Amino acid sequence: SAAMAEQRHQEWLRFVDLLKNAYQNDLHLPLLNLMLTPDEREALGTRVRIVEELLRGEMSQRELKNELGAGIATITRGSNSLKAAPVELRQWLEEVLLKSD
Amino acid sequence: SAAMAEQRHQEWLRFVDLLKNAYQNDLHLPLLNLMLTPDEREALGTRVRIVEELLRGEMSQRELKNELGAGIATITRGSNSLKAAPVELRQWLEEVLLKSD
What we know:
Chains A, B: It is found in: Cytoplasm. Chains A, B: One of its GO terms (cellular component) is cytoplasm. Chains A, B: This is Trp operon repressor. 2 copies of one chain form a homodimer. By secondary structure, chain A is mostly helical. Chain A has helices at about 5-25, 30-35, 40-55, 60-70, 70-85, 85-95. The first copy, chain A, has 6 helices and no strands. Chain A is globular and about 40 Å long.
């Protein structure tokens, strides 16, 4: 639904503002368990590792499937989205994932 | 993987602590676009509505599929997780989704 991308954008921002508010309340853990599936939480964990490793540049896409157990399409998309990422984010992720904290 | 639930729990907490940090940096929008698919962001939007409506108690499960366009299994799980939710969260969601802000 390209036609209804605006509604869908609004609906998404609602979720981000709710989570926002839960983090300031320390209710973020319960909210996240409520909103997401185990499957989804597992995936997110694994997406962190992909980005960390794409930022690292040491591993090849296939080593990445083997050592991380993430499907190739997840890697490819993870690759695409990072490039589209604003520089400011990229710098920050480097800082945190590969400068650690 | 029940056996590796602990590793998977740790990997999840990493993502929550990263997001945490992005919200305090105002880098939460870009991070979320990076980590999640359109599909996933659409779903989350839609999960908010399910919870709001389950809290409302006016609609039946099937009206819920029809007016919200969410699969029955999503509703059923959304139902199950809310019951398992800590009272403190439940109160808060009532406050926010049905007391609004």
